[PDB]
Every structure is written in C-alpha cells, then in structure tokens.
Amino acid sequence: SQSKIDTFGRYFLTYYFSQEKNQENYQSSLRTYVSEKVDISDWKALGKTLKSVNYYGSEQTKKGYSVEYLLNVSVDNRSKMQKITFEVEPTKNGFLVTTQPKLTDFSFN
Amino acid sequence: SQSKIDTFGRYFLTYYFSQEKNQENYQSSLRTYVSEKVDISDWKALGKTLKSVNYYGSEQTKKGYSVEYLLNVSVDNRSKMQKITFEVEPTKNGFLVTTQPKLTDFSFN
Amino acid sequence: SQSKIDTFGRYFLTYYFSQEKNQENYQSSLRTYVSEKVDISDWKALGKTLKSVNYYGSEQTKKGYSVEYLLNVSVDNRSKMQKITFEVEPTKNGFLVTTQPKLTDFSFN
C-alpha cells in the first residue's frame, strides 16, 4: 500500500520516541508494534524529543520492507536532521517491526 | 492525485471534527466539502478532539473513491485510535464528500 | 520516491517561509536547497507564517518534477489557503529546487 506502512511507522515512532523514564512501561507501550522475534528488553527511552516526522520511502525486503523516515530530533540543546531505518513485516491485516531502528545523520547534499 | 484526495480529506476532517456547538454554523462550515446530494441537517459536532490524522489509502468506487484515515480522537483527555471512512467524487475544479463518514474502532494487531 | 520529493519539499518550505529579516541570512539558510543556477540574490523573507503544509502531488518535467503543496499561511492573524508550486531535480546525492516558488490563492470549489 505505502500509506498503510507509512502510517504504521508513524504510530510506532510515537512510542519508540516516547520519553517514559521507567524502562518497563516504555517497552510495554511499544510491545504491540514489535514482533516477538525481537528482544526489546534492552531498548530504553532515547533522550530525544521528536519534533517532526516525514515518510521517506520503503524498499522491499525478503520477508517485508525496509522503511525510512526523516526526523527532526532535539537532544541536549541542538536540533538536527536524522534518518531512522527499520524493517517491518506484514501480518494478517496489520504490520510488525522486525529490527531495532537505526538512527543516522542525514543531509540532502 | 492520491495526494490531492488525501489533502482534501484532511481539510474536510478539520471541519467535520470541529467542536462548534451551534449546529447551524457547524453545518455551514462544512457545506462546501459535502455534495448537495447528501443531507447534513442532522450532522452535529461530535464532542471529540482530533489529535492526529493519517491518510490510510483509498479504493475505487463506480463513482469515485472510498478514503480511509487513521485518527487519534480525544475525549476528556484520553485518546484512542479509530479509522474513519467516507466517499469522495471528483468535480470539475476539485472534490466532494458524497457519504456520511463512518467512524470505527481500529488496531494494527 | 514520491515520498522523498515530498519530504524534501517540506524541508525547503520551512526555510523558504522563514521570517529571518536579514536578507543574507535568509538566503544562506536556504542556499543548500536551491540549485546554484537559480538567482536567489533578491529573495527576501515573505512576511508570512506557515501554519500547515500538505503535499499536493507532482507532475513530471523534462529533468525533474513540478511539485505542489497546499498551505495555510497567516499574515495578520488573517489566515488563508494557498497553493505553492516549484520544480525540483534529483542530484546524485539528493534534490535541488530549480525555479522560484509560485504562490497562488486556492480553494476546493
């Protein structure tokens, strides 16, 4: 679809970027988006305020899709462009995240 | 475009979800979005706050398109996710909503 | 990607609609988004506040894409719907704007 996967990623990103300080509820609040094949026990709140999110396309993978978003994230005191990448897999109506997302510096240059 | 229907729907939703307590003004603020073929005299403010809107795709009808959005709707401080569906039809210069939107519970899993 | 031109255009619009009153700084902050072949020596802050941006689709050109967005701009606290059109060309690494954006009045009717 594209829309569907896009939207799904945005919802996941809302919880992934949550600032809940207690690691247990943080994981619990994002459990539903992440496949059981992934161990989220070491994921915690990332210390980063999500200021904007834009869908940056998908690439077909073997079992699903790799998706990208462009983000403005604020940390410490400064605001910068990142890309976030993660894989998803379709489920019987719906989606699941299947890798830990990678955050990297990005520019259009 | 897929984009143009998307954008049109977002605009309509802003008015559809408006909290105007006077049912006359509520209807007239959305009149231009909705086809004259549709009777909006019982539409009123829904008491819900729209916290977020994501385009969820369309599919063709004989006459136009059935569009879906995923919404975050809030009452008394708490949000839940819903799908909203409604039909649109192209007009010479734009688009019109041609059915009363259907608002339904939704989840990814 | 359609996604990618869309997002690029959003980032550009943020700088293009910046209200920076120093002409050299307004130009510098948007420099990387615009092709060097465009004369940006006379672009100034437009005195308009950008309340919302929705992607409105693209149209292939000889070397790129003509993109459109629907905007809510605010001038005095008087808000209105506008459309903005400009062209964009890929670069091996990303994208560049290649025309000066056209802003025009818009409605769905």
Tab-separated table of C-alpha atoms in Angstrom:
chain	number	residue	atom	x	y	z
A	1	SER	CA	0.000	0.000	0.000
A	2	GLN	CA	2.547	2.683	1.157
A	3	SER	CA	0.053	4.788	3.030
A	4	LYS	CA	-0.589	1.900	5.377
A	5	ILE	CA	3.040	1.121	6.047
A	6	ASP	CA	3.819	4.872	6.311
A	7	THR	CA	1.052	5.373	8.883
A	8	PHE	CA	2.020	2.299	10.801
A	9	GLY	CA	5.615	3.524	11.089
A	10	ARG	CA	4.404	6.879	12.416
A	11	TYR	CA	2.470	5.237	15.203
A	12	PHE	CA	5.425	3.058	16.141
A	13	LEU	CA	7.686	6.169	16.051
A	14	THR	CA	5.446	7.938	18.563
A	15	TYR	CA	6.016	5.161	21.104
A	16	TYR	CA	9.624	4.474	20.115
A	17	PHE	CA	10.447	8.101	20.708
A	18	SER	CA	8.480	8.330	23.990
A	19	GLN	CA	10.297	9.704	26.990
A	20	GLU	CA	8.837	7.387	29.680
A	21	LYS	CA	11.742	7.111	32.177
A	22	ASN	CA	10.764	3.720	33.545
A	23	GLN	CA	12.046	1.148	31.049
A	24	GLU	CA	9.253	-1.348	31.804
A	25	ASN	CA	6.321	0.711	30.680
A	26	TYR	CA	8.337	2.104	27.802
A	27	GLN	CA	8.802	-1.427	26.484
A	28	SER	CA	5.281	-2.364	27.304
A	29	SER	CA	3.907	0.628	25.428
A	30	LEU	CA	5.746	-0.413	22.295
A	31	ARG	CA	5.402	-4.161	22.572
A	32	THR	CA	2.367	-4.312	20.384
A	33	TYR	CA	4.266	-2.839	17.304
A	34	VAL	CA	7.378	-5.013	17.567
A	35	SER	CA	7.458	-8.699	16.505
A	36	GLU	CA	8.062	-11.313	19.250
A	37	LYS	CA	11.174	-12.404	17.308
A	38	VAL	CA	12.822	-9.193	18.579
A	39	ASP	CA	14.047	-8.831	22.093
A	40	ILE	CA	13.237	-5.366	23.364
A	41	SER	CA	14.477	-5.911	26.848
A	42	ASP	CA	17.482	-3.544	26.367
A	43	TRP	CA	15.511	-0.830	24.468
A	44	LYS	CA	15.038	2.266	26.539
A	45	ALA	CA	13.867	5.870	26.204
A	46	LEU	CA	16.429	7.500	23.927
A	47	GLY	CA	16.645	11.025	25.455
A	48	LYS	CA	15.441	12.692	22.249
A	49	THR	CA	12.447	14.886	21.530
A	50	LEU	CA	10.674	14.063	18.309
A	51	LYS	CA	9.837	17.295	16.584
A	52	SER	CA	8.630	16.185	13.184
A	53	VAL	CA	8.381	13.047	11.179
A	54	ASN	CA	8.291	12.539	7.452
A	55	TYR	CA	7.977	9.373	5.498
A	56	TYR	CA	10.947	8.704	3.375
A	57	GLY	CA	10.056	5.609	1.374
A	58	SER	CA	10.317	1.819	1.581
A	59	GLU	CA	12.431	-0.855	-0.048
A	60	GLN	CA	11.066	-4.366	-0.478
A	61	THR	CA	12.996	-6.931	1.532
A	62	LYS	CA	12.763	-10.798	1.541
A	63	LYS	CA	10.101	-11.084	4.243
A	64	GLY	CA	8.842	-7.482	4.238
A	65	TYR	CA	10.026	-3.905	3.857
A	66	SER	CA	12.718	-1.564	4.982
A	67	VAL	CA	11.218	1.859	5.755
A	68	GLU	CA	12.810	5.250	6.191
A	69	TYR	CA	11.739	8.448	7.883
A	70	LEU	CA	13.340	11.834	8.132
A	71	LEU	CA	13.168	13.315	11.629
A	72	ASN	CA	13.955	16.460	13.435
A	73	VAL	CA	15.150	15.460	16.766
A	74	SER	CA	16.243	17.686	19.605
A	75	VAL	CA	18.781	16.434	22.183
A	76	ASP	CA	20.913	18.358	24.646
A	77	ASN	CA	20.147	21.848	23.224
A	78	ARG	CA	20.530	21.453	19.439
A	79	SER	CA	18.099	20.426	16.692
A	80	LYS	CA	19.238	18.189	13.733
A	81	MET	CA	18.107	16.056	10.807
A	82	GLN	CA	18.279	12.346	11.148
A	83	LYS	CA	17.176	9.374	9.199
A	84	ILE	CA	15.629	6.408	11.030
A	85	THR	CA	15.525	2.983	9.339
A	86	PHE	CA	13.745	-0.151	10.435
A	87	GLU	CA	12.264	-3.268	8.924
A	88	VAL	CA	8.616	-4.289	9.037
A	89	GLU	CA	6.689	-7.451	8.190
A	90	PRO	CA	3.064	-7.619	7.163
A	91	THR	CA	0.677	-9.515	9.435
A	92	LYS	CA	-2.858	-10.882	8.821
A	93	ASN	CA	-4.216	-7.324	8.419
A	94	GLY	CA	-1.589	-5.020	10.025
A	95	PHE	CA	2.201	-4.799	10.438
A	96	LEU	CA	5.067	-5.542	12.834
A	97	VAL	CA	8.535	-4.001	13.304
A	98	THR	CA	11.281	-6.651	12.907
A	99	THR	CA	14.598	-4.879	13.589
A	100	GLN	CA	15.821	-2.328	16.056
A	101	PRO	CA	15.674	1.070	14.292
A	102	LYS	CA	18.957	2.720	13.195
A	103	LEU	CA	19.304	6.437	13.624
A	104	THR	CA	21.837	8.207	11.405
A	105	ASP	CA	22.857	11.735	10.415
A	106	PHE	CA	21.421	12.840	7.122
A	107	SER	CA	21.578	15.782	4.750
A	108	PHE	CA	20.171	16.302	1.250
A	109	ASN	CA	23.678	17.212	-0.064
B	1	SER	CA	-3.630	12.640	-7.255
B	2	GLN	CA	-3.606	10.195	-4.340
B	3	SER	CA	-2.083	13.257	-2.716
B	4	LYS	CA	-4.926	15.546	-3.731
B	5	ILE	CA	-7.655	13.292	-2.343
B	6	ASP	CA	-5.543	12.867	0.790
B	7	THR	CA	-5.172	16.598	1.309
B	8	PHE	CA	-8.841	17.249	0.532
B	9	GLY	CA	-9.897	14.695	3.148
B	10	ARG	CA	-7.643	16.334	5.770
B	11	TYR	CA	-9.268	19.660	5.182
B	12	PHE	CA	-12.771	18.233	5.404
B	13	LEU	CA	-11.827	16.400	8.627
B	14	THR	CA	-10.786	19.625	10.304
B	15	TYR	CA	-14.362	20.884	9.827
B	16	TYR	CA	-16.058	17.555	10.382
B	17	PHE	CA	-14.379	17.315	13.749
B	18	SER	CA	-14.885	20.923	14.693
B	19	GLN	CA	-16.397	21.473	18.120
B	20	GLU	CA	-18.818	24.276	17.137
B	21	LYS	CA	-21.776	23.905	19.494
B	22	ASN	CA	-24.218	25.728	17.190
B	23	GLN	CA	-25.379	23.060	14.773
B	24	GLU	CA	-26.150	25.607	12.071
B	25	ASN	CA	-22.692	27.065	11.858
B	26	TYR	CA	-21.167	23.606	12.180
B	27	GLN	CA	-23.052	22.533	9.097
B	28	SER	CA	-22.368	25.623	7.164
B	29	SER	CA	-18.610	25.491	7.896
B	30	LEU	CA	-18.537	22.069	6.172
B	31	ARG	CA	-21.057	22.668	3.432
B	32	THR	CA	-18.507	23.351	0.669
B	33	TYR	CA	-16.835	19.946	1.287
B	34	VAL	CA	-20.003	17.878	1.087
B	35	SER	CA	-22.045	17.168	-2.030
B	36	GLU	CA	-25.562	18.690	-2.144
B	37	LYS	CA	-26.790	15.096	-2.728
B	38	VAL	CA	-26.053	14.489	0.963
B	39	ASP	CA	-28.336	15.732	3.684
B	40	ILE	CA	-26.293	17.201	6.509
B	41	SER	CA	-29.139	18.615	8.549
B	42	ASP	CA	-28.656	16.085	11.367
B	43	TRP	CA	-24.838	16.304	11.400
B	44	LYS	CA	-23.628	17.923	14.525
B	45	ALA	CA	-20.443	18.469	16.473
B	46	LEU	CA	-19.200	15.152	17.732
B	47	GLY	CA	-17.643	16.260	21.032
B	48	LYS	CA	-14.301	14.720	20.045
B	49	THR	CA	-10.867	16.418	19.684
B	50	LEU	CA	-8.810	15.421	16.695
B	51	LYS	CA	-5.213	14.905	17.885
B	52	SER	CA	-3.763	13.430	14.760
B	53	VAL	CA	-4.712	12.431	11.242
B	54	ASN	CA	-3.047	9.948	8.942
B	55	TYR	CA	-4.051	9.101	5.462
B	56	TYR	CA	-4.734	5.404	5.101
B	57	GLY	CA	-5.443	4.947	1.438
B	58	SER	CA	-8.288	4.767	-0.979
B	59	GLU	CA	-10.076	2.366	-3.258
B	60	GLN	CA	-12.190	2.985	-6.325
B	61	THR	CA	-15.954	3.081	-6.440
B	62	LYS	CA	-18.113	3.237	-9.593
B	63	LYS	CA	-18.386	6.931	-8.961
B	64	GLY	CA	-15.201	7.858	-7.089
B	65	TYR	CA	-13.117	6.717	-4.147
B	66	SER	CA	-13.580	5.403	-0.654
B	67	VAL	CA	-10.931	7.000	1.553
B	68	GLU	CA	-9.636	5.986	4.982
B	69	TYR	CA	-7.788	7.860	7.657
B	70	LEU	CA	-6.412	6.717	10.955
B	71	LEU	CA	-7.286	9.214	13.646
B	72	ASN	CA	-6.367	9.917	17.153
B	73	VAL	CA	-9.514	11.138	18.727
B	74	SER	CA	-9.613	12.512	22.268
B	75	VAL	CA	-12.439	12.911	24.866
B	76	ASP	CA	-11.822	14.027	28.448
B	77	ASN	CA	-8.099	13.821	27.954
B	78	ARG	CA	-7.825	10.236	26.711
B	79	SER	CA	-7.108	9.331	23.050
B	80	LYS	CA	-7.966	6.234	21.081
B	81	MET	CA	-7.263	5.223	17.523
B	82	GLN	CA	-10.069	4.973	15.062
B	83	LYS	CA	-10.485	4.584	11.327
B	84	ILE	CA	-12.714	6.990	9.501
B	85	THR	CA	-14.057	6.148	6.055
B	86	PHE	CA	-16.069	8.148	3.556
B	87	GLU	CA	-16.526	8.501	-0.149
B	88	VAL	CA	-15.424	11.350	-2.368
B	89	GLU	CA	-16.018	12.259	-6.005
B	90	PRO	CA	-14.015	14.491	-8.314
B	91	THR	CA	-15.739	17.625	-9.510
B	92	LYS	CA	-14.519	19.772	-12.405
B	93	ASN	CA	-12.481	22.013	-10.093
B	94	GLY	CA	-11.932	19.708	-7.069
B	95	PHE	CA	-13.634	17.115	-4.862
B	96	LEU	CA	-16.750	16.494	-2.805
B	97	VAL	CA	-17.582	14.163	0.068
B	98	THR	CA	-20.537	12.005	-1.002
B	99	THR	CA	-21.353	9.893	2.114
B	100	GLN	CA	-21.573	10.392	5.861
B	101	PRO	CA	-18.200	9.387	7.349
B	102	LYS	CA	-18.050	6.054	9.167
B	103	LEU	CA	-16.001	6.088	12.296
B	104	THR	CA	-14.845	2.635	13.550
B	105	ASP	CA	-12.525	1.125	16.186
B	106	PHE	CA	-9.188	0.058	14.897
B	107	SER	CA	-5.888	-1.558	15.736
B	108	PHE	CA	-2.833	-2.860	13.932
B	109	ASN	CA	-2.540	-6.267	15.685
C	1	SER	CA	10.320	8.105	-4.377
C	2	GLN	CA	7.200	10.359	-4.347
C	3	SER	CA	7.764	10.262	-0.597
C	4	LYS	CA	11.228	11.635	-0.906
C	5	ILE	CA	10.389	14.625	-3.147
C	6	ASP	CA	7.510	15.433	-0.833
C	7	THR	CA	9.707	15.419	2.287
C	8	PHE	CA	12.451	17.373	0.576
C	9	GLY	CA	9.909	19.995	-0.441
C	10	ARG	CA	8.709	20.270	3.156
C	11	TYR	CA	12.186	20.928	4.447
C	12	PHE	CA	12.739	23.582	1.799
C	13	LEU	CA	9.379	25.217	2.686
C	14	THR	CA	10.471	25.582	6.290
C	15	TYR	CA	13.461	27.694	5.184
C	16	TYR	CA	11.681	29.444	2.352
C	17	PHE	CA	8.936	30.548	4.736
C	18	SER	CA	11.400	31.553	7.444
C	19	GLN	CA	10.823	35.023	8.739
C	20	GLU	CA	14.524	35.974	9.107
C	21	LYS	CA	14.628	39.665	8.383
C	22	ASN	CA	18.351	39.759	7.484
C	23	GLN	CA	18.366	39.068	3.713
C	24	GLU	CA	21.867	37.476	3.689
C	25	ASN	CA	20.958	35.022	6.442
C	26	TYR	CA	17.557	34.201	4.877
C	27	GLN	CA	19.351	33.360	1.679
C	28	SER	CA	22.093	31.393	3.407
C	29	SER	CA	19.761	29.183	5.326
C	30	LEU	CA	18.010	28.148	2.121
C	31	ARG	CA	21.106	28.035	-0.135
C	32	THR	CA	21.664	24.244	0.032
C	33	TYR	CA	18.088	23.529	-1.083
C	34	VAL	CA	18.306	25.678	-4.202
C	35	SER	CA	20.264	24.949	-7.354
C	36	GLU	CA	23.114	27.436	-7.936
C	37	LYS	CA	21.552	28.059	-11.330
C	38	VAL	CA	18.665	29.909	-9.729
C	39	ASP	CA	19.227	33.604	-8.912
C	40	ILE	CA	18.358	33.863	-5.202
C	41	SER	CA	20.133	37.213	-4.683
C	42	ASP	CA	16.734	39.063	-4.435
C	43	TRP	CA	14.698	36.553	-2.314
C	44	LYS	CA	13.608	38.057	0.982
C	45	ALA	CA	11.555	36.805	3.921
C	46	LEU	CA	7.982	36.970	2.677
C	47	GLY	CA	6.430	38.121	5.999
C	48	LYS	CA	4.045	35.114	6.027
C	49	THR	CA	3.676	32.497	8.734
C	50	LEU	CA	3.349	28.915	7.737
C	51	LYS	CA	0.592	27.180	9.750
C	52	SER	CA	0.378	23.925	7.810
C	53	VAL	CA	1.751	22.110	4.815
C	54	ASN	CA	0.146	19.333	2.821
C	55	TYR	CA	1.717	17.687	-0.181
C	56	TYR	CA	-0.465	18.112	-3.276
C	57	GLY	CA	1.344	15.932	-5.813
C	58	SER	CA	3.837	16.200	-8.593
C	59	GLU	CA	3.997	16.299	-12.326
C	60	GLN	CA	6.974	15.041	-14.232
C	61	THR	CA	9.045	17.628	-16.161
C	62	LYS	CA	11.913	17.166	-18.612
C	63	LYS	CA	14.560	16.875	-15.868
C	64	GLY	CA	12.561	16.671	-12.706
C	65	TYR	CA	9.253	17.230	-11.107
C	66	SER	CA	6.948	20.115	-10.595
C	67	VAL	CA	5.631	19.763	-7.008
C	68	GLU	CA	2.637	21.401	-5.334
C	69	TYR	CA	1.640	21.960	-1.729
C	70	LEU	CA	-1.452	23.395	-0.064
C	71	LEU	CA	-0.604	25.818	2.724
C	72	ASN	CA	-2.375	27.690	5.421
C	73	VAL	CA	-0.472	30.955	5.701
C	74	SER	CA	-1.120	33.662	8.238
C	75	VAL	CA	-0.425	37.352	7.633
C	76	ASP	CA	-2.042	39.455	10.382
C	77	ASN	CA	-3.666	36.569	12.187
C	78	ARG	CA	-5.745	36.568	8.967
C	79	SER	CA	-5.364	33.007	7.707
C	80	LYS	CA	-5.923	31.766	4.136
C	81	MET	CA	-5.433	28.759	1.916
C	82	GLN	CA	-2.661	28.982	-0.642
C	83	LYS	CA	-1.029	26.716	-3.180
C	84	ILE	CA	2.712	26.753	-3.822
C	85	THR	CA	4.354	25.289	-6.945
C	86	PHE	CA	8.068	24.908	-7.729
C	87	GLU	CA	10.325	22.479	-9.616
C	88	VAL	CA	12.842	20.027	-8.183
C	89	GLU	CA	15.611	17.946	-9.808
C	90	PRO	CA	17.463	14.981	-8.450
C	91	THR	CA	21.168	15.179	-7.770
C	92	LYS	CA	23.255	12.023	-7.499
C	93	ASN	CA	23.017	12.514	-3.719
C	94	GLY	CA	19.508	14.091	-3.314
C	95	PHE	CA	17.482	17.043	-4.691
C	96	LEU	CA	17.564	20.687	-5.622
C	97	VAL	CA	14.818	23.300	-6.182
C	98	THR	CA	15.196	24.765	-9.692
C	99	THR	CA	12.535	27.506	-10.062
C	100	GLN	CA	11.409	30.304	-7.790
C	101	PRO	CA	8.224	29.033	-5.992
C	102	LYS	CA	4.832	30.406	-7.239
C	103	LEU	CA	2.343	31.168	-4.535
C	104	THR	CA	-1.321	31.496	-5.621
C	105	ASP	CA	-4.742	31.701	-3.976
C	106	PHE	CA	-6.578	28.406	-3.806
C	107	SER	CA	-9.816	26.709	-2.906
C	108	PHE	CA	-11.524	23.325	-3.481
C	109	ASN	CA	-14.648	24.795	-5.140
